[PDB]
Design a protein around this nucleic acid. Structure first.
Ligand SMILES: [Zn+2]
Ligand SMILES: [Zn+2]
Lengths: 196, 196
DNA sequence: CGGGCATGCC
DNA sequence: CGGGCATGCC
């Protein structure tokens, strides 16, 4: 069986979608999202809020899993890991790229067969008056980190799963972790218009 | 006592000097030396020949030690180490930046008090007809390596020591380990002329 | 903060 | 190979 997780969007019977809060497009804004590229630009070790939207209520015990995969075909089969420097320098294993902050029920998985890392939290329905649920993700390396992502773009795959392990929904977005998300967002959108 | 080793030139009673073989100044020549800057530009994990010249014959049992120190005052007291990436990826301990190739009597020292790394080989007199002795050094990180030198320039300190531990001579040269020694040499010499 | 150097890599 | 992008940092 494949050790490469699926990245194909599957909004599913609950109408599962992701949302992202708009930002101020300063050169070094901490986080900004491009709808045109379906791509988050963010800084390392700083909060990246991701909204979960659903049309129907998931059952009790639903979980939310995040997992990184390399976007380029030639790197898809390599597990995405923290670089040795940031690994060397209290729940998250130091090898995990993606953390969740602000949740008391976070679980970190090292898959015993595929060796892939993932981080899971319970799904919580949005509070009254609110239309979505926000998870605070953290990426612990830059996309450029030598010995880690090494300038290779990744996708974050967000899966909605029931307690039995059924896939309820899947979405993904590209990520560039970088020093200057505003500059790099502008550059990539201009490149899309001029050369895409 | 100081844990910062001396970098002051001490040619000494044997007339100890260093020599460097000229190169072709291609953009990515493997090694090239600037007399004006007293600075070697070289590529990582590739041979860097350094010549030992003396006016008088060192006694039997003389040793040749190499040690890296950061050139900038604000970094002088930090031990120069291999970065975590190149450490993770058969005599040299993986934490040592400087290796010697082509010698059967190499010793690697981790100083128990100063924590400084050094690599030592016996001094051999130049063969008949030859005016100097060549040691093949290897630098196992780029100057830019994140978590290691991190773009901070270093000096290599070469000391001539008798078997009793007396300092016979000391010389040093700055090093930039980089992908394109020819380009970076030209840039730094032009910067010296224009802004030095 | 935004302009521009940096430097392994394309 | 040398021109020029790359991107954390100055
Ligand atoms: Zn890293
Ligand atoms: Zn290194």
């Amino acid at each position: 069986s494949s050790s490469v997780p699926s990245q194909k969007t599957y909004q599913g019977s609950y109408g599962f979608r992701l949302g992202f809060l708009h930002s101020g497009t300063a050169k070094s804004v901490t986080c900004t999202y491009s709808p045109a590229l379906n791509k988050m630009f963010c800084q390392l070790a700083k909060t990246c809020p991701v909204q979960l939207w659903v049309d129907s209520t998931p059952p009790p015990g639903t979980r939310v899993r995040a997992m990184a995969i390399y976007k380029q075909s030639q790197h898809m089969t390599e597990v995405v890991r923290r670089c040795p420097h940031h690994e060397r320098c209290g729940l998250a294993p130091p090898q995990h790229l993606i953390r969740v902050e602000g949740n008391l029920r976070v679980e970190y998985l090292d898959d015993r067969n595929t060796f892939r890392h993932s981080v899971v939290v319970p799904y919580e329905p949005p509070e009254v008056g609110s239309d979505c649920t926000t998870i605070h993700y953290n990426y612990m390396c830059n996309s450029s980190c030598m010995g880690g992502m090494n300038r290779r773009p990744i996708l974050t795959i967000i899966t909605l799963e029931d307690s039995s392990g059924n896939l309820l929904g899947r979405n993904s977005f590209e990520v560039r972790v970088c020093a200057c998300p505003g500059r790099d967002w502008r550059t990539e959108e201009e490149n899309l218009r001029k050369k895409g």
